[PDB]
């Protein structure tokens with residue numbers, strides 16, 4: 001509860017130097033896919049289809 | 050101009066091998082398909098091969 005009044009003010013007499021962390025992702029892993037290897041791995045009939 | 054992903058490095062087979070068990074005898078084709086008597090269908094005979 002803030003002690004509000006029409007003629008009262010609160011003024012700081014000191015200060016705190018505070019250091020905080022913010023962590024942000026920037027990049028993800030780059031991937032490549034060989035379709036023939038994934039679907040028809042070393043099968044000539046599957047590769048031809 | 051640039052760098053392009055190609056297919057993964059393929060190695061072709063050099064020879065074909067076949068590995069079957071040490072089996073000598075022929076299956077009893079004469080006993081199965083040339084039996085003198087055959088069972089009735091209600092009492093059908095089962096033979097292990």
Ligand SMILES: *[C@@H]1O[C@H](CO)[C@@H](O[C@@H]2O[C@H](CO)[C@@H](O)[C@H](O)[C@H]2NC(C)=O)[C@H](O)[C@H]1NC(C)=O
Pocket residue numbers: 013014015
């Ligand atoms: C303002 O705040 C600082 C730190 O919050 C006060 O410094 C401390 O003062 C006490 C008492 O003199 C010491 O025991 C601490 O070692 C001090 N800390 C540091 C980091 O210096 C300072 O006294 C405050 N000033 C006023 C006017 O309130």
Ligand SMILES: CCCCCCCCCCCCCCCCCC(=O)O
Pocket residue numbers: 076077078079081098
């Ligand atoms: C004597 C029992 C043999 C058991 C063999 C088990 C493996 C199955 C292979 C096929 C055997 C029967 C093939 C029949 C040949 C048919 C020829 C035709 O089309 O006239």
Ligand SMILES: *[C@@H]1O[C@H](CO)[C@@H](O)[C@H](O)[C@H]1NC(C)=O
Pocket residue numbers: 079083
């Ligand atoms: C089938 O059985 C008959 C009667 O025993 C025989 O004459 C014939 O040679 C047999 N055939 C084969 C392929 O074994």
